[PDB]
Design a protein around this nucleic acid. Structure first.
Ligand SMILES: [Cl-]
Ligand SMILES: [Cl-]
Ligand SMILES: [Cl-]
Ligand SMILES: [Mg+2]
Ligand SMILES: [Mg+2]
Ligand SMILES: [Rb+]
Ligand SMILES: [Rb+]
Ligand SMILES: [Rb+]
Ligand SMILES: [Rb+]
Length: 136
RNA sequence: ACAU
DNA sequence: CGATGT
């Protein structure tokens, strides 16, 4: 109903899908960029959205912050809830890096606790998430 | 259908 | 127009 402004917003950006993948997290209230991942040569939109949420969890936990995370990705929210990224991307030499990071994000989820609410950014009502890359 |  | 996902 109402945006929770005291929150972290995350999003993926890509050049192609599958293609070059990156992600960032911003303060929802101000747009200040809080973290940005270096581009990964090949990955999918959903793998990137998943990594962005997990990185947000780790960021907030390290800073003892109870803020929720907003994501526009129904898929990535479910994958994080399940602690399992059900990606169709082939595992081969070209995709080794993205899959390493996805595997390591799952591993972190299975070995750590958090109470962070992971909320759906309601794009249809609120416009583009504040972490969007402005490429569409 | 919905979400990217 | 194409792709990734539930
Ligand atoms: Cl990552
Ligand atoms: Cl909340
Ligand atoms: Cl959701
Ligand atoms: Mg998104
Ligand atoms: Mg976006
Ligand atoms: Rb902590
Ligand atoms: Rb975009
Ligand atoms: Rb969107
Ligand atoms: Rb589809």
């Amino acid at each position: 109903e109402e945006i929770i402004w005291e929150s972290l917003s995350v999003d993926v950006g890509s050049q192609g899908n599958p293609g070059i993948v990156e992600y960032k997290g911003v303060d929802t209230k101000t747009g200040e960029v809080l973290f940005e991942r270096e581009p990964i040569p090949i990955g999918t939109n959903n793998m990137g959205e998943f990594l962005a949420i997990v990185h947000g969890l780790r960021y907030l936990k390290e800073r003892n912050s109870r803020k929720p995370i907003y994501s526009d990705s129904q898929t990535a929210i479910k994958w994080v809830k399940d602690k399992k990224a059900k990606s169709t991307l082939v595992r081969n030499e070209e995709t080794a890096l993205i899959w390493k990071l996805v595997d390591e994000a799952e591993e972190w989820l299975n070995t750590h606790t958090y109470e962070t609410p992971i909320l759906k950014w309601q794009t249809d009502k609120w416009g583009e998430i504040k972490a969007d890359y402005g490429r569409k």
